[PDB]
Swiss-Prot record, chain A:
InterPro entries: Ank_repeat_dom-contain_49, Ankyrin_rpt, Ankyrin_rpt-contain_sf. The keyword Chaperone applies. It comes from Mus musculus. ANK repeats lie at residues 1-34, 35-67, 68-100, 101-133, 134-166, 167-199, 200-224. It is found in: Cytoplasm; Nucleus. Disulfide bonds: none annotated. Acts as a chaperone during the assembly of the 26S proteasome, specifically of the PA700/19S regulatory complex (RC). In the initial step of the base subcomplex assembly is part of an intermediate PSMD10:PSMC4:PSMC5:PAAF1 module which probably assembles with a PSMD5:PSMC2:PSMC1:PSMD2 module. Independently of the proteasome, regulates EGF-induced AKT activation through inhibition of the RHOA/ROCK/PTEN pathway, leading to prolonged AKT activation. Plays an important role in RAS-induced tumorigenesis. It comes from the Eukaryota. Induction: Up-regulated by activated HRAS. This is 26S proteasome non-ATPase regulatory subunit 10. Part of transient complex containing PSMD10, PSMC4, PSMC5 and PAAF1 formed during the assembly of the 26S proteasome. Stays associated throughout the assembly of the PA700/19S RC and is released upon association with the 20S core. Interacts with PSMC4. Interacts with RB1. Interacts with CDK4. Interacts with MDM2. Interacts with RELA. Associates with a CDK4:CCND2 serine/threonine kinase complex. Interacts with ARHGDIA and increases the interaction between ARHGDIA and RHOA, hence promotes ARHGDIA inactivation of RHOA and ROCK.
Swiss-Prot record, chain B:
The lineage of its organism: Eukaryota, Metazoa, Chordata, Craniata, Vertebrata. Component of the 19S proteasome regulatory particle complex. The 26S proteasome consists of a 20S core particle (CP) and two 19S regulatory subunits (RP). The regulatory particle is made of a lid composed of 9 subunits, a base containing 6 ATPases including PSMC4 and few additional components. Interacts with NR1I3. Interacts with PAAF1. Interacts with TRIM5. Interacts with ZFAND1. This is 26S proteasome regulatory subunit 6B. The modification N6-acetyllysine is found at K62, K66. It comes from Homo sapiens (Human). Belongs to the AAA ATPase family.
């Protein structure tokens, strides 16, 4: 309904496939024309989820790693907006899995935060660094744990993400799971080795941050993991 | 305020807004700055305004980054 100042981008977002192919086949430069957001038809097509348009662009050979003015590459956009097919297509074409935007996030931060399970797996199979830290020193796991994304927490641990990385507030993902009462998340993290002993910057451990009972449960489970092994 | 509450207010205020699919409010919810329920409301309003300045009816990540920086000090 008009999201850009450049027509080809509005076409890209609105899914006008035939018009887009038609104009671009006449003027190939339109495929890489930038708008007021340093976006091209690719960024917009990824955002709206128009797989066909994206495929056309990629077969045409357009660059796949150009970031928009907020630092978002097409893979950040597709991953975040949950576009599986497009994400796959982008990876075959060489999209950078560990590219960062203006806030230090990789596409994996978004996939994890927004429950994009299948996408997270593709990114991780694609070489994604599970411990990438954003500008506040937060990882994909901090986002998943904080929000209560259980299965995503499984996936990250299963691809060996570290559980004891501290963000600028000194919080690990367990601290976050605890503070937001994400029970199953917290339990899984402790059963998976997360430390119940790390003090954050307010000098509070995950236990002190949790509900009284939750603290006692995690306490027991941590000592259970200690005892055996 | 509660990080959980902070998320609730952000999703509540932006629930009537037209955000692009790639926007992830957790980028803001997760920040360390202590902010009020009023700041979140202003951040959200300022984001819509910044979108309008670009004759854009969809709100983008950049609008939020911008608005966050404006409101929070």
């Amino acid at each position: 309904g008009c999201v850009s100042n450049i027509m080809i981008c509005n076409l890209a977002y609105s899914g006008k496939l035939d018009e887009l192919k038609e104009r671009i086949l006449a003027d190939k430069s339109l495929a890489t024309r930038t708008d007021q957001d340093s976006r091209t038809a690719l960024h917009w097509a990824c955002s709206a989820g128009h797989t066909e348009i994206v495929e056309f662009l990629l077969q045409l050979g357009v660059p796949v790693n150009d970031k928009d003015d907020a630092g978002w590459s097409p893979l950040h956009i597709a991953a975040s907006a949950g576009r599986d097919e497009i994400v796959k297509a982008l990876l075959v074409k060489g999209a950078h899995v560990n590219a960062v935007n203006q806030n230090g996030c990789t596409p994996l931060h978004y996939a994890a935060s927004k429950n994009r399970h299948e996408i997270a797996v593709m990114l991780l199979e694609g070489g994604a660094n599970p411990d990438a830290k954003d500008h506040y020193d937060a990882t994909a796991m901090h986002r998943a744990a904080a929000k209560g994304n259980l299965k995503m927490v499984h996936i990250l641990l299963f691809y060996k993400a570290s559980t004891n990385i501290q963000d600028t507030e000194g919080n690990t993902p367990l601290h976050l799971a605890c503070d937001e009462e994400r029970v199953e998340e917290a339990k899984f993290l402790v059963t998976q080795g997360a430390s119940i002993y790390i003090e954050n910057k307010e000098e509070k451990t995950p236990l002190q941050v949790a509900k009284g009972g939750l603290g006692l449960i995690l306490k027991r489970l941590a000592e259970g993991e200690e005892a055996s092994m | 305020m509660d990080r959980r509450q902070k998320r609730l207010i952000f999703s509540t205020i932006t629930s009537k807004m037209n955000l692009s699919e790639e926007v992830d409010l957790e980028d803001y919810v997760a920040r360390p700055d202590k902010i009020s329920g009023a700041d979140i409301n202003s951040i959200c309003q300022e984001s819509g305004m910044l979108a309008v300045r670009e004759n854009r009816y969809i709100v983008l990540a950049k609008d939020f980054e911008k608005a966050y920086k404006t409101v929070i000090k």
